[PDB]
């Protein structure tokens, strides 16, 4: 019934996996080997096996062994079943064409088989959550190749992404404007709906909303995982509606190319900020329209809301939600879609969030995540195509991708659709 598989591609991808899986373990009551004192709604993302070991609906993929050997070295190593942990040897190494052509095809069948043997143990499979970067070698290259092959293999069955987006301050690679535009170009037609994660936003929210002075990527994944646990909470807790990934697609798309929402999650408050600790449903619903708490750090003061779903988890009443939503619709100068009426899809799950035992957030009675489709991310695309153009103009770095199987036309074609993604983001509005 209604089961989902998380597919963790890339080092970042995998380390958000770690934090997500560790968090689902605590959430469900699952000891770090496998045993648990109870039962209940582990159903979807975990499988109970004969000897009481509760095994993830996971696939972890890395293009070298190193990120995944830390998994199977450390804690939950006895939870993670060896068949679901897939290593490479010779990596893509930040180069998109190595991840799509050369090295990627060397694991692709093997990732798809262990996907298929996990999927064939899914009574009511909904689909996939793929976590990957738009910017890396592994993450960018192997995921777009993986998306094409999964669109042929599972077809009707949904592909959600949790996609790592670089930013105009926080960036990673030189060739990353290619990685981004190249990967997207491929994903656009194949993928279903993608929850862009901006690594600057998470970094910035941890500093300003979490009051952390020295965060590490462990601290960052803790906020990331809390938005992914908030989305996945609908399958995993008790509550009202929204228990399925397709309602996310269905209700968030204005047009299907424009399949990239922004997630807000609230409250992002530190355990140490225990003075104004009593937050209301209104308070945390205000925070979801606040430019601070946006997982994608673009300017909502330029960009329009096209579509909103509010997912509440914990001590939340829907009288309180109605009241919140009516007054947020009066207060904030939010532009909306014309063809449709006012747009909020509301989800209520009764159980609060969980922090990790060293976790930075407060152990709040209630929480919310807003999934919202905005035109604000065209600002972010615009910065990305303008960087592509810079580099492409001189032809810089492009010998490494064309010299590993790629055609230069593919760059032209990619950029042309990204420039049409720009026009789609213009045309919704006039």
């Amino acid at each position: 019934m209604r089961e989902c598989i998380s597919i963790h591609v890339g080092q970042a991808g995998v380390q958000i996996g770690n934090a997500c899986w560790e968090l689902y373990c605590l959430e469900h009551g699952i000891q770090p080997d496998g045993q648990m004192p109870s039962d209940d709604s582990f159903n979807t993302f975990f499988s109970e096996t004969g000897a009481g070991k509760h095994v993830p609906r996971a696939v972890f993929v890395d293009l070298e062994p190193t990120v995944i050997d830390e998994v199977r070295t450390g804690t939950y190593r006895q939870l993670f079943h060896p068949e679901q942990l897939i290593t490479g040897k010779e990596d893509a190494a930040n180069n998109y064409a190595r991840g799509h052509y050369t090295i990627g095809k060397e694991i692709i069948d093997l990732v798809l088989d262990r996907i298929r043997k996990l999927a064939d143990q899914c009574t009511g499979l909904q689909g996939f959550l793929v976590f990957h970067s738009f910017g890396g070698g592994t993450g960018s290259g192997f995921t777009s190749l993986l998306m094409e092959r999964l669109s042929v293999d599972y077809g009707k069955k949904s592909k959600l992404e949790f996609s790592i987006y670089p930013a105009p301050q926080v960036s990673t690679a030189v060739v990353e404007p290619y990685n981004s535009i190249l990967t997207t170009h491929t994903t656009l037609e194949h993928s279903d709906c993608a929850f862009m994660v901006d690594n600057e936003a998470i970094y910035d929210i941890c500093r300003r909303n979490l009051d952390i002075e020295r965060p590490t990527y462990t601290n960052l994944n803790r906020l990331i995982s809390q938005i992914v646990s908030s989305i996945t909470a609908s399958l995993r807790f008790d509550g009202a509606l929204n228990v399925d990934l397709t309602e996310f697609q269905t209700n968030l798309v204005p047009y299907p190319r424009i399949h990239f929402p922004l997630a807000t999650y609230a409250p992002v408050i530190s355990a140490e900020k225990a003075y104004h600790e009593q937050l209301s449903v209104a308070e945390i619903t205000n925070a979801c329209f606040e430019p601070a708490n946006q997982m994608v750090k673009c300017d909502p003061r330029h960009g329009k809301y096209m579509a909103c779903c509010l997912l509440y988890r914990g001590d939340v009443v829907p009288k309180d939600v109605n009241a919140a939503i009516a007054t947020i619709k009066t207060k904030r100068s939010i532009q909306f879609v014309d063809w449709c009426p006012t747009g909020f899809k509301v989800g209520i799950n009764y159980q609060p969030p969980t922090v990790v035992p060293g976790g930075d957030l407060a152990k709040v009675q209630r929480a919310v995540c807003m999934l919202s489709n905005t035109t604000a991310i065209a600002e972010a695309w615009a910065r990305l195509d303008h960087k592509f153009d810079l580099m492409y103009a001189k032809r810089a770095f492009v010998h490494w991708y064309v010299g590993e199987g790629m055609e230069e036309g593919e760059f032209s074609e990619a950029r042309e659709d990204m420039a049409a993604l720009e026009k789609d983001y213009e045309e919704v509005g006039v």
Binding site: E70, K89, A93, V170, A173, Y203, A393, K394
Partner: protein
């Protein structure tokens, strides 16, 4: 990817190379009897990257040592870690080419070249997931220069798919007893530009001034200097040897470093090198590290990048620390010092952080810069090369050892095309 095959060539190349191996061997916790003493489990982790698991509990370096003069292999063999090297892998002649690249590339070294090839094939086919090859040689001597470049090309004709890493040491305009070094240089650069993936350009000039100004030392003694070489050479190999954050390998390094494939000459730099034992004051933290790491005074090529822009920087941090503070300190530096980067290359600074530091320290930072200012070096060799070449001075000592004059003309022709190339992308703008 997993295994690197290391190749040392010439007197320098084998002395800086043994000093490298005693550094990485102390990091990986292995002694001069080849025993693993490592107190942390993580010391054995990626051990097979640099090491071979030999018969029994012995870890042996995957190192091949080449020289024509056999007293170099004796000073290695009678060196402090001597027994750690496998004596099959001591590849020695009985002469010495004698600061003559030609007797390297054409005479003596092309007689030795095949004995060497048999041992790098043997390291190679024994590797499970081979990364590629790592040669340490000189761009100025006789053994390292012509026999190095003979090597670079010969292995690469055999393995063109895997990665060709080199540590290529550059001769000083201040010192050296050997006059003909720019001849050996021009001749080498011509082969290097055609056959390496990446070239760390290791200038003796800078190593001298780094040691004389920063650390303190007056006349040039190679054992003290070779410590700063070996510490840099550990520094950049970090990400291959040990896990942490981004850029694990050399390909994801070189892919992110090189805009146009002939511009692969990198400018090394290393941090902290402050007043030993006492300071303990002055600097400690990750922005202080990032500062020292970005400083022209901490650069290991003699080209001041304050006179010629940076394309790309790869920065290898070592220790447990904040990925955010590097993201911000690399943001900060590139905003503020924007006019020393190039505008057409966006995102110029690339960052790795490894949890493991070196020994002697708790935190470290290694700079690797692909700088347009490396042209001042190619100009220095040229202006000197063409000086002697126009009067056809010393030419007979080399043309007599096999070469045509037109090979001096061609080696010049590519070095000066390499110059136009480096001069372009210094000058260039956006649009």
């Amino acid at each position: 990817m997993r295994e690197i095959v290391h190749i040392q060539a010439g007197q320098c190349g084998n002395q800086i190379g043994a000093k490298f191996w005693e550094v990485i061997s102390d990091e990986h916790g292995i002694d001069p009897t080849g025993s693993y003493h490592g107190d942390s489990d993580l010391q054995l982790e990626r051990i097979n990257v640099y090491y071979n698991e030999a018969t029994g509990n012995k870890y042996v370096p995957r190192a091949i040592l080449v020289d024509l003069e056999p007293g170099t292999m004796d000073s290695v063999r009678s060196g402090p870690f001597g027994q750690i090297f496998r004596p099959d892998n001591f590849v020695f002649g009985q002469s010495g080419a004698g600061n003559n690249w030609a007797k390297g590339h054409y005479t003596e070294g092309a007689e030795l070249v095949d004995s060497v090839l048999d041992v790098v094939r043997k390291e190679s086919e024994s590797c499970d997931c081979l990364q590629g090859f790592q040669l340490t040689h000189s761009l100025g001597g006789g053994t390292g220069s012509g026999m190095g470049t003979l090597l670079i090309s010969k292995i690469r004709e055999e393995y063109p798919d895997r990665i060709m890493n080199t540590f290529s040491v550059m001769p000083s305009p201040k010192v050296s007893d050997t006059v003909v070094e720019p001849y050996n240089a021009t001749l080498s650069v011509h082969q290097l530009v055609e056959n390496t993936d990446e070239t760390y350009s290791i200038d003796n000039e800078a190593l001298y001034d780094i040691c004389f100004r920063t650390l303190k030392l007056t006349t040039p003694t190679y054992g003290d200097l070779n410590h700063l070489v070996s510490a840099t050479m550990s520094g950049v190999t970090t990400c291959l040897r040990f896990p942490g954050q981004l850029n694990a390998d050399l390909r994801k390094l070189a892919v992110n470093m090189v805009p146009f494939p002939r511009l692969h000459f990198f400018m090394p730099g290393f941090a902290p090198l402050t007043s030993r034992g006492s300071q303990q004051y002055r600097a400690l933290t990750v922005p202080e590290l990032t500062q020292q790491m970005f400083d022209s005074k901490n650069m290991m090529a003699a080209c001041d990048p304050r006179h010629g822009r940076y394309l790309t920087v790869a920065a290898i941090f070592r220790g447990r620390m904040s990925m955010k503070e590097v993201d911000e300190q690399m943001l900060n530096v590139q905003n503020k010092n924007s006019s020393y980067f190039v505008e057409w290359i966006p995102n110029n600074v690339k960052t790795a952080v490894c949890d493991i530091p070196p020994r002697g320290l708790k935190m470290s930072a290694t700079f690797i810069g692909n700088s347009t200012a490396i042209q001042e070096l190619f100009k220095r060799i040229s202006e000197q090369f063409t000086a002697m070449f126009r009067r056809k001075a010393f030419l007979h000592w080399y043309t007599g050892e096999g070469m045509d004059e037109m090979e001096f003309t061609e080696a010049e022709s590519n070095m000066n095309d390499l110059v136009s190339e480096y001069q372009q992308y210094q000058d260039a703008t956006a649009d």
